[PDB]
Design a protein around this ligand. Structure first.
Ligand SMILES: [Cl-]
Ligand SMILES: [Cl-]
Lengths: 192, 192
């Protein structure tokens, strides 16, 4: 029996779609049972629907408080019985209270080499620090910053912008998230 | 005409020896003209001598002040006419005054992914932060921390110690320093 995964998104769902694609393979140890979003306009939803994955939207504005919003989400999760929850560009902070029932089972991808640049603008920040490598991190989300599960590095090239660098790191995220999920559920880069 | 390089060491000279080895190749754009040490017991000296490189020791204890020590070193450098100075485990801080005549021409290797862990115990620190990649950085030394020139990353494996990790990063340093010197003088790693 494969691990049941629910992916959360708020935007275009690039990493969500990478997870859905990797999970189609024979013997992959997880299946994607739903994609949840806090935004109806999130481009990832249409992508999930086209690949035949159930989708659910819970808008914050539709509840009287953040707790009522997390409560609706938890009740909805419970009917799906996920084993693993993957955040893939979800833009809301999870309370400790939300995390508790899924302690140790919530993963997140972040486009820096944590603990560097744990907040926003990670690619510009790498360029501003003059770094020659950058990358991404999958970690557990904890009751900021649970245990790192996996990391990937790519070169920063002469002449990169935040946009060119982000696009390269994103190829790496597409490969890293499935690998971390595979490891969870079941040489060197030189830049000069 | 090749770039003339003087390497500084205080210890066994592993990276010094990597630079000396890379420079033997036809068409390599640098030659190693001397190795300087602040310690007569530095194991790198014997290695330099066996490869036919002139060596010089200036002990701090033999001068009345740090300035007189840097003064002797600068005068000695001047007779060798280096174009590039490489620090390879040299354990003394260079004053701005020492750096000025070689501004932009002094390189250093550090066994972390700067700006992470810029001081000591870099491998233990990476393990304590739970990182899955670690590596090394060649940077310019400035009148801590000049512009990064090159970086390399290697995986941190399940079960690494500071010692196993240091040894892996050291293979990467051996490859990184020559590459940075080559660039100066003239895809991705996933870990889960
Ligand atoms: Cl950015
Ligand atoms: Cl260490």
């Amino acid at each position: 029996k494969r691990n049941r995964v629910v992916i959360f998104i708020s935007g275009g769902g690039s990493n969500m779609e990478a997870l859905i694609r990797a999970a189609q393979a024979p013997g992959f140890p997880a299946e994607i049972v739903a994609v949840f979003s806090d935004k109806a306009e999130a481009g990832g939803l249409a992508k999930a629907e086209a690949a035949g994955i159930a989708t659910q939207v819970f808008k914050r504005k539709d509840f009287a408080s953040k707790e009522a919003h997390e409560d609706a989400i938890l009740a909805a999760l419970d009917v799906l019985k996920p084993d693993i929850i993957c955040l893939a560009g979800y833009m809301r902070l999870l309370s400790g209270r939300f995390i508790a029932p899924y302690e140790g089972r919530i993963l997140n991808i972040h486009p820096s080499l944590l603990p560097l640049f744990p907040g926003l603008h990670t690619h510009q920040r790498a360029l501003d620090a003059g770094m020659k490598l950058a990358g991404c991190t999958v970690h557990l989300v904890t009751e900021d910053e649970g245990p790192i599960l996996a990391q990937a590095a790519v070169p920063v090239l002469d002449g990169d912008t935040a946009e060119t660098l982000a696009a390269r790191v994103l190829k790496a995220e597409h490969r890293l998230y499935p690998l971390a999920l595979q490891k969870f559920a079941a040489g060197m880069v030189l830049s000069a």
